[PDB]
RNA sequence: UUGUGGCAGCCAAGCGUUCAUAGCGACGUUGCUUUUUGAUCCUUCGAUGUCGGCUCUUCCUAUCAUUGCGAAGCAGAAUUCACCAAGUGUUGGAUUGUUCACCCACCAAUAGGGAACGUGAGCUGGGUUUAGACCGUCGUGAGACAGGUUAGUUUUACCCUACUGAUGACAGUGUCGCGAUAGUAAUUCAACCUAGUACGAGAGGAACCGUUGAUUCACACAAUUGGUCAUCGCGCUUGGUUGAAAAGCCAGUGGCGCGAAGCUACCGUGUGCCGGAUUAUGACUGAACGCCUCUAAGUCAGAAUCCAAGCUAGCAUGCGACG
RNA sequence: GGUGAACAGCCUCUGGCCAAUGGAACAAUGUAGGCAAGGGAAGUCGGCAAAACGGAUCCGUAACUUCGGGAAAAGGAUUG
């Protein structure tokens, strides 16, 4: 499927919502299909779906938890090329358990690892890079 | 072969190397080193830093 | 009492002891198993670690992500000059194990491999072998060294010959006294490969005619030192709070009570590195062979004409100038090291050791500092 | 010792829509366990440092997942019962000092346990357990509380052994070897195709082979990325100072920017292993027993199991060849 | 003496010292000092320890109030 790359975000992390949704603000609380290690923080990378709570955004999303996909990581991270490719602010779009694009659309760049795994936020995409 | 043209010094990049930072205006920048890199983020100007390929287009060298 | 949280153990110990290696050489521990049906051929060669670089190749992976995709990959070239065959030695199987039934050596030997042979060469009156190289140029002698070799043909059942590298081909190593090892031959019956053995002592084996290109092989060496190291650092436990008394960096529990004694399986504080190890199933990508095209660094698409070695030689080695391997992955011990290239043991039929490989480009910027320039000749007309 | 705590057998009234035994099994009844609690008071009161957590190792099976199987009120999917099975794994967090508990989430799974209720010259000192102090109930009072709260010193290894590594004598000296024996390491999951196929009224809905990755772990290594700077490498710069410029120097590394070399990171990269015997189980031939029958004699297929192979050590005061 | 609000710290002049047993090496664990990519208390009984803020000028300054304060609140800009 996907390649490994270089994991940044842990539990606890604060991201930008970058889509139209309301939410100003994710807050991970976990990350899908990680099989855990004492005393290791889960850590959520490009595509990872994972689980997180608004903090600061709109009153009808807050204090529920909800699959969201991260789309924009400031770790750099090796692409197969050799390049370390990144972005400029850690950011995810909250998507349904199936993965279907909850909001409208994506502000900011988006990361080609995230899009071609999730067809609809490939979609919703406005500049993949 | 396929090289490219760092964005702060103006250099070639040849393939298997180079970091690119994806500003939030969705441009590319492609930095050699970790010294454009740094030099870039540090808000300097290229074309003020005196090795820089800019620099040297811009005062004719 | 039990564990409240388990956790995998640190460390691994399939490798103990961890001491130092009682030898310097990768000794071949276990060699390709004999196939008579095949053609005669060696099963080990010698390099030497040069140093790394990196590649970037076209990979066809039907149903991977990168396939029809160019990738980046580290590369170890391995400088890897002819072995001189000085030597033949036969095995004869005992209840015991293997026997080393007897041995030939060649009429002449060079003036390092018979450095091998001392300790303090210099003061020595370098007579190693003098009396015994004698027994050529007598009709008697002759007739034993025959003799021998019926003997060898006739009785043995394991066959190997004694090679040495070139030592002094490479300037960039400060030394002189060569590296000595035993290649055991495969295929054949015991007469081909005594009779191959024989008629091949004192001329240089290639090191193609060890290996081919996109072949496995399985490097053997001496790790990095590393020296007398805490223990977070041999075995990687976790370190202990900040605020604890008497130190942190420790294991805080050696055992329990009973038995009443430290087990062995305790993280303990001691020798890291400069270890034995054998690590397998390293691809071989490229043979520079010296004297024709297909030794420079130069791929079927880039054409800058450049050869292996990069900018400024490589860091602690030198220059490259002799023939080389070069592996995908990294490579045991530090760059001048001796390093031993064995045929697999396995059966390569999986396709990731299948796939041919083309190369796209080598960098050779220097890989001291942040190489920018792949020669020195497009640095040069690039300053002016 | 085992009342008590936990566990597991026997009979079979019934439940299980019909049906005792797929799955339970009441009235009864037989046992096992030493993590609970009780009983005792045998060692210890010229002191065995007392709860918990962190760390780290090892072992047990009364098996949660993981491999192979048998049974079903097993159509598929899922789930339940049991068997050979302890190799491998069993997580991040909210609140509590808590073991325990109970939620959120991941997971293939979030099983239970022992090791002087493992582990204080290993940590911590939150609880408890001195002296200060406050509240409440009690006492006439000093004071008490298996009531609540706050503050409250955590000493020593250099000995022996164990363990980790380091030399080293013993047939002169040196190269190459042999390989007794000991350690051992790989684990699991995901996606595509198979396939919306088999199965199924429909609803739903597998798997083998094949392909590509990943998780935990291990061993290396440093081309790139990152990290580190007292290269006091270059530059800049504050305060003082050598009359000034230049060059410097002091402020224990003056500070800042970049910073090669080395070291290093699942924060970077590579690699991680082939045969034989068999357990469960299902079978072959085949009697006892004119038939049957996997067992009785003989055979077979068979697993994360076993032993090898492979990897490490090899002062086994072991051995071989040659100089 | 200089900087500086300053008997702060930092550096120098008069005066006084180099007295704390020295040589080699730069291994683990320490004592003291630092720096760290992405995240930012998830660690732990507990933000313990460290980092961060810090001078000055200009603006602005909430609840509550015993009307005295809170207040250097908070929040901004500038500095060679
Ligand atoms: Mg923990
Ligand atoms: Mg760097
Ligand atoms: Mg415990
Ligand atoms: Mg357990
Ligand atoms: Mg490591
Ligand atoms: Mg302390
Ligand atoms: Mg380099
Ligand atoms: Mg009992
Ligand atoms: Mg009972
Ligand atoms: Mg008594
Ligand atoms: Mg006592
Ligand atoms: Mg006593
Ligand atoms: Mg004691
Ligand atoms: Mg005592
Ligand atoms: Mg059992
Ligand atoms: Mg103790
Ligand atoms: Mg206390
Ligand atoms: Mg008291
Ligand atoms: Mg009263
Ligand atoms: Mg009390
Ligand atoms: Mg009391
Ligand atoms: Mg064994
Ligand atoms: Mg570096
Ligand atoms: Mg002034
Ligand atoms: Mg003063
Ligand atoms: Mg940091
Ligand atoms: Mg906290
Ligand atoms: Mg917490
Ligand atoms: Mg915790
Ligand atoms: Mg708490
Ligand atoms: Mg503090
Ligand atoms: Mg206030």
């Known amino acids: 499927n996907k390649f490994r790359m270089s994991l940044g975000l842990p539990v606890a992390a604060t991201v930008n919502c970058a889509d139209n949704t309301g939410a100003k603000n994710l807050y991970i609380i976990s990350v899908k299909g990680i099989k855990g290690r004492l005393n290791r923080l889960p850590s959520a990378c490009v595509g990872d779906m994972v689980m997180a709570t608004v903090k600061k955004g709109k009153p009808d999303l807050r204090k529920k938890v909800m699959p969201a996909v991260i ?59 | 072969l396929k090289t490219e043209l760092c964005r702060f010094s103006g250099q070639k990049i040849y393939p298997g190397k180079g970091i690119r930072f994806i500003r939030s205006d969705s441009q590319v920048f492609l930095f050699a080193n970790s010294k454009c890199k740094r030099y870039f983020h540090n808000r300097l100007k290229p074309a003020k830093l005196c090795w820089t390929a800019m620099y040297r287009k811009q005062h004719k060298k | ?25 990768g000794k071949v521990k276990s060699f390709p198993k004999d196939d008579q049906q095949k053609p005669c051929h060696l099963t080990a060669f010698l390099g030497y670690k040069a140093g790394m670089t990196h590649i970037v190749r076209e990979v066809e992976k039907p149903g991977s992500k990168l396939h029809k995709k160019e990738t980046c990959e580290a590369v170890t070239i391995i400088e890897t000059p002819p072995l001189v065959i000085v030597g033949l030695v036969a095995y004869v199987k ?3 194990g293997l026997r080393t039934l007897n041995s030939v050596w060649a009429q002449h030997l ?12 210099c003061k020595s009156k ?28 006739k009785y043995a059942t394991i066959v190997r010959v004694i090679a040495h590298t070139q030592i002094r081909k490479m300037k960039g190593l400060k030394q002189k006294k060569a590296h000595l090892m035993e290649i ?9 490969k005594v009779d191959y053995g024989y008629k091949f002592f004192e001329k240089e084996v290639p090191v193609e005619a060890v290996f081919q290109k996109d072949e496995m092989v399985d490097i053997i060496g001496v790790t990095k030192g590393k020296g007398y190291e805490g223990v977070v650092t041999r075995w990687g436990v976790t370190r202990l709070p900040r605020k604890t008394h008497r130190g942190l960096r420790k294991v805080a529990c050696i055992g329990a009570w009973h038995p009443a004694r430290v087990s062995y399986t305790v993280a303990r504080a001691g020798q890291n590195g400069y270890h034995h190890r054998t690590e397998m199933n390293k691809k071989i990508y490229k043979m520079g062979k010296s004297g024709q095209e297909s030794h420079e660094a130069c791929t079927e698409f880039d054409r800058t004409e450049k050869d292996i070695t990069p900018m400024g030689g ?3 080695y030198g220059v490259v100038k002799g023939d080389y391997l070069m592996i995908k992955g990294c490579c045991v011990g530090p760059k001048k090291r001796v390093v031993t290239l064995r045929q697999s043991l396995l059966k390569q039929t999986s396709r990731l050791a299948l796939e041919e490989i083309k190369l796209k480009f080598i960098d050779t910027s220097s890989k001291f500092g942040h190489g920018r320039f792949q020669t020195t000749d497009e640095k040069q007309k690039f300053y002016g």
């Not at chain 1, 602010?89 to 199936?98: E, Q, T």
């Not at chain 3, 060079?110 to 060469?121: A, H, I, L, Q, T």
Request: charged letters at 30%.
């Open chain 1, 71 to 129: 789309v924009r990581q400031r770790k750099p991270w090796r692409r197969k090329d050799g390049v370390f490719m990144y972005f400029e602010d850690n950011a995810g779009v909250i998507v349904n358990p199936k993965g279907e694009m909850k909001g409208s659309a994506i502000t900011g760049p988006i990361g080609k690892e995230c899009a071609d795994l999730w067809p609809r936020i490939a979609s919703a995409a406005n500049a993949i890079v």
């Open chain 3, 1 to 25: 009492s039990h564990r409240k949280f388990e956790h995998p153990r640190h460390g691994s110990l399939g490798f103990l002891p961890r001491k130092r290696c009682s030898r310097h050489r």
């Open chain 3, 94 to 96: 005992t209840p015991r």
């Open chain 3, 110 to 121: 060079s003036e390092d491999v018979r450095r091998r042979f001392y300790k303090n060469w």
């Open chain 3, 126 to 153: 370098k007579k190693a072998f003098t009396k015994y190289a004698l027994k050529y140029d007598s009709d008697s002698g002759k007739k034993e060294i025959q003799l021998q070799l019926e003997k060898m043909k």
């Open chain 3, 184 to 192: 055991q031959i495969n295929g054949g019956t015991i007469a081909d």
């Open chain 3, 314 to 316: 490589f860091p602690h």
